[PDB]
């Protein structure tokens, strides 16, 4: 195996745990640090040129954090669990004025993750895939990142066929949450740029840097 799912899962286990939009942002900034630790535990990531590592996490960070906190919320009803340990409910989200994007996270990601019982090996793999985004502008060698992306989804397909043989379209199912993830990522980014632009909200330094 050039890409064992086993190691992707340890990566996940390794990095593991009052205006709601201030809270979300504190969490985001905190988790940006946990993300860099996670990516380093992903096979071959650390071997890439420092430049491409930077491009990938600058490209992926938003989608990757959304994947984490969505899968972390599967047990939760009508709400998300932040890394801070603090739950945000949809009522709190509508009342800060982020109900639309919030609802989208619940219905398109959390609910779907709960309904199919997406395991942490699968979350890992999807996040690993999002990381190895060959579309990322500026990459020294896109072919290599394509080839790593290829190793991940091959491994996952076999993990699914083996672990959930009853569900022959589980693999496809998993891959068809990445579009929803892409949409929700960009809407979140549009929001974060506004919290910054407006200065309504404290933006801690690493999140700050990801928005510059």
């Amino acid at each position: 195996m050039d890409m064992p799912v086993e190691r992707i899962l340890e990566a996940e286990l390794a990095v593991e745990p009052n205006d709601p939009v201030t809270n979300i942002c504190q969490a985001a900034d905190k988790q940006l640090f946990t993300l860099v630790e996670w990516a380093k535990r992903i096979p071959h990531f650390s071997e890439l040129p420092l430049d491409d590592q930077v491009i990938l996490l600058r490209a992926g960070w938003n989608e990757l954090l959304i994947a984490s906190f969505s899968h972390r919320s599967i047990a939760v009803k009508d709400g998300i669990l932040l890394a801070t340990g603090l739950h945000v409910h949809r009522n709190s989200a509508h009342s800060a004025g982020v109900g639309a994007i919030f609802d989208r996270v619940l219905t398109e990601l959390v609910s779907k993750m709960r309904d199919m019982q997406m395991d942490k090996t699968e979350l890992g793999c999807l996040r690993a895939i999002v990381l190895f985004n060959p579309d990322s502008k500026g990459l020294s060698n896109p072919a290599e990142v394509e080839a790593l992306r290829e190793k991940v989804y091959a491994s996952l397909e076999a993990y699914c066929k083996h672990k959930y043989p009853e569900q022959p379209g589980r693999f496809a199912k998993l891959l068809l949450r990445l579009p929803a993830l892409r949409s929700i990522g960009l809407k979140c980014l549009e929001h974060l740029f506004f919290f910054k632009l407006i200065g309504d909200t404290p933006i801690d330094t690493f999140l700050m840097e990801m928005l510059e």
Binding site: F33, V36, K40, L50, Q53, V54, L57, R58, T205, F206, E209, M210
Partner: peptide, 13 residues
């Protein structure tokens, strides 16, 4: 230059 992102990525550990 992405100061913080770069400093987290160099450090072994």
């Amino acid at each position: 230059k992405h100061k913080i992102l770069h400093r987290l990525l160099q450090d072994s550990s």
